[model samples]
Target: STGSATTTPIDSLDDAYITPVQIGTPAQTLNLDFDTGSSDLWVFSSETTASEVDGQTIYTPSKSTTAKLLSGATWSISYGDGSSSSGDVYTDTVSVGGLTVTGQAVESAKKVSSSFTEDSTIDGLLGLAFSTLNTVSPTQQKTFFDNAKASLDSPVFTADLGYHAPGTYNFGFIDTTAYTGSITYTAVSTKQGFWEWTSTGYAVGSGTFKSTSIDGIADTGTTLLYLPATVVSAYWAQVSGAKSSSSVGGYVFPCSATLPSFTFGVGSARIVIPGDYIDFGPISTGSSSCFGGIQSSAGIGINIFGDVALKAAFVVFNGATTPTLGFASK
Candidate 1:
């Protein structure tokens, strides 16, 4: 009931975190991206076209004795990054960390987009978000966390997402050792099928916190922190030689620029993202210029508190009827 799983750094910890999960009876281990933005236990499968499989480790249901065909059931999913995959479904035992659930729904990919096919490390995506966002058709599929919740000591999980280092994803328990001080809890609105929460306001450096209502998702799959256009513009205006670039799809600045730290309000608590974190390395490989990690979502409707922002704090995701999120400094 008190089990938790830790992940290893995959290709780049800056991009995505990979965890080992076993599927089926004999358990075919696959390295999956622990994505909190979505909710579908999908895998790169032997069912996919050979050309699209790339160098990923594929899940073969036929190879597992416990794998059962969920006939007529299928699933398809697309991410905000324009990546997608579609395939059939199978019922099998799925295990993560030390928790195992039988008859869990596992979507096996038959086709994948070139965007996903080129990614060599990710074998699949292990969604930790609400099951309401799952892509299974005919009948909705529950996430691994949903299926394993009841057996847990508590129906909660902690995401200790790191910047460039390995972090732990603790289930059913919150490790006090991982975070500092008291955790300030906030109300969440799941109306959008995401862990969308509201940050009352924000500030640049020690400036007064502006009363800006930002509706955003705790999206681990996303690399940058995206906010409203007006908010992004205000923040970028402080930087010298910063401009919106279509080539980079965001704001780019000189590598020598010194960015101001950002602070967001959550009730009485203030979480600050380091100024250095805003420097998203460079616009392109070996380029001296840099892109802003906090960009404008514009038409994307909701903003995203992506990896850049999340790594600055420890997040607790409560899966109760009235779900809530808890955050504290790391």
Candidate 2:
């Protein structure tokens, strides 16, 4: 009737938060990256070349009694960062925590880009995006959440991402205990197959909120917060010794520079990101230059409110004809 699962950061999680999920009849458990930016439940599989798999675990459909190959079906996908993967399709039982979805479309990767192959900590990707974005050829497939929604007590999921710690992804119910104060609700437009929403305004540090509407997505898959070029330019301008760098990519600031909190509007409710979270991390070992956590969304096309922003709040990804986002301080 409902489900809940705990997720832990991968050492630093300057990149991503991963959670465990079970696939197939007897359940071949895999630690999957819960990505809201894309829609496809895919894994490195037995079909993957040993040379390309590296330290990542692969799903073996042959060993699972309930796994069924979807004849003639294939899928290929490319991420915003240019990571790509291709594979055959299979239908199997997939479960996150206690809730199970029968006949879930699972992509078994025969090939993976270097980014995914080299990332050993993540065994697969569990997409929370709209099912309309799924890549299955000949037949578009539904996500595990889409298939399981009918049996759920409520069509909602809460993402409580943590920094260098443990958080939770709750299904079918919202755990009010995880957050503080009142949760602010915002309208989402899924025309782009994302939980895309518009912000009322933004402010650098504790400065006055300038009235403007910024359209962006709440993407858990992305690791950094991206915004329009003008927005990013104005923000970094306030940081001393910060400059746009082609070598460092995006923007870079002095590691020792005093940083200011970044605030973005949620209607009238602002979710302020602490100054410490903006420095990202050092560009390299022993370097005073640090890569910025907030940057321009220029080439990536769409703006992303990634892990750095999401970890500051408890977020609700609501499922309805008109999906809405709810956020509260954690």
Candidate 3:
């Protein structure tokens, strides 16, 4: 039953970015980015000129028998990364994985920034992350999960990132092969959008930075984990004669040797970052070499555990079943 559906390629970053759900129908495929950074499901409209909507997927409403546009309501969203877009509101029947949700509030972008316009492949992002950061007001808004929950057999949704290829971001169901034990759920905080927490400390090589018992929010949007300066220095210190070199942008150590492994404590969970993840891409800084996993973002105040961290575990956002978050092993 798991292999019954073929994964479609998203074709954004040369990686096999695909979603299990086919937008519109089996014939009219739409590439979607299931972003957790925000909560919104927008698509590019066919009415959008090719020159204006470059590198984005265009949605042809005429092709769908269930498409409807809102008479007057408009929607807009701005991201923390300084990217924003706005569009007219529309209602239509959107289907995902053979499941149909009618009267879905879809946003059609009439205006987008240069960053969005430049990308030749990305059509639009489907915000499956959380509901707290939704741009649509409470008075006049409906999310895909909000509309689709009633029709789903299970009142839960899990993202199986590892089982499928790079682009296959599945929704509505959890791939049993992705995990083993029961999911460990975390209560949602009162904060908006970003998952917030207090990090206890970090460990580099075999040395401990500050004390264990660290706590922090695990974010999927961020590209790297941001640790305190003290923890960062302690980590590099254990690199076995590894001195910090500025050539590679941040900390760089001498070549000809591999750095020791580092781990970060989250409550009782110990996340180990292998040396290879630290020195990703085999990139070097001048005469010094670099590590991929560990880097510096001391003053940023938040620890963003990006894709590297997600690859190590199974993350479940149970927005439909309960207002909580869950994580487990893959």
Candidate 4:
């Protein structure tokens, strides 16, 4: 009834996390990005254009006896990064960790953007968001989590993303030993098909809490933490050489600068992100200016508590009749 999976960072920047997944009867294994921001379990497969296939692994549905075409079903999606992909659909036995779904919808990539092709380590994405966000046409398909939730001991999953290290994703039950202190639960709005919630406020370094409620989504798919300009600017001001640079495409500072910590309130709990976590490495090869992990969300339309923030705590994605998000320090 319960299952767990370990996620490993694929790149030096810890830009994305990938977990191994099993697909089809013959058990074709592929490393997939467990993305909570989107709802489509898509993969690179034999159906994909040969020119688009780089060093990534492909899922050959024809090699699996259990694979069945979801006739006429097609899916297309575009990401914030301007990358996109689209393809037809098939149903197959898919397994993650120890949980198995006999008839999980699997989108086979027929066309993929250069961004995806360049990232050779990530073969595909296993979306964990609500099924409403699924891009499949004619008839929308359920996510791997949505299809397996009914049989799980509990309709919930937890994400423990690490900082340049391996983390875990637990399904069906919470691991009491994974976190410290008590969990603080908050209401989540599923209308947008995201694990969207509101934070009580935030503070720059050791400053007092700002008491301003900020609405954001807990997106494991994103690499940086995005907040209001006021908050982001406040945090960077404390750094001696920090500045917004159009050249770097975001806020950057001297690699030698000692950064300050960031704190955000989740319900009654205050989670502190270490300063080192905000130092998102150099802007380029051997560059002196380091990119900041926290940036302004002004142009982003909405704030996002991405991997940068999620790494600071143990997060629970409760998918009950009334969904709720729980945060705990570790």
Q: What C-alpha lDDT do the candidate models reach, one value each?
A: 0.87, 0.88, 0.58, 0.94
lDDT of 3 at 21: 35
Q: Which stretches of candidate 4 lie over 4 Å from their true place?
A: none
Q: Evaluated with lDDT, which candidate comes out highest?
A: 4
User: Across residues 126-200, which tens digit of lDDT does each residue of candidate 4 receive?
Assistant: 999899999999999999999999999999999999888999999999999999999999999998999999999
RMSD of each: 1.4, 1.1, 4.5, 0.7
**After aligning candidate 3 to the native by TM-score, how far in Å is the CA of 126 from where it should be?**
1.1
Model 2 lDDT, residue 263, Cα: 86
Off by over 4 Å in 2: none
Residue 129 Cα positional deviation in candidate 3, in Å, after optimal superposition: 3.2
Candidate 2 residue 246 C-alpha distance from true site, Å: 0.8
* Segments of candidate 1 deviating more than 4 angstroms: 9-13
lDDT of 2 at 187: 98
* Stronger candidate by TM-score (3 vs 4): 4
Of the two candidates 1 and 2, the one with more favorable lDDT, higher being better, is: 2
lDDT of 1 by residue, 13-59 (tens): 27777888889878899989889899998999989989998899999
lDDT order, best first, reads 4, 2, 1, 3
**Could you tell me the lDDT of residue 52 within candidate 3?**
72
Worst 10 residues of 1 by lDDT: 4-13
- Please, what are the lDDT tens digits per residue for candidate 3 over residues 179-202? 766566666543755444444456
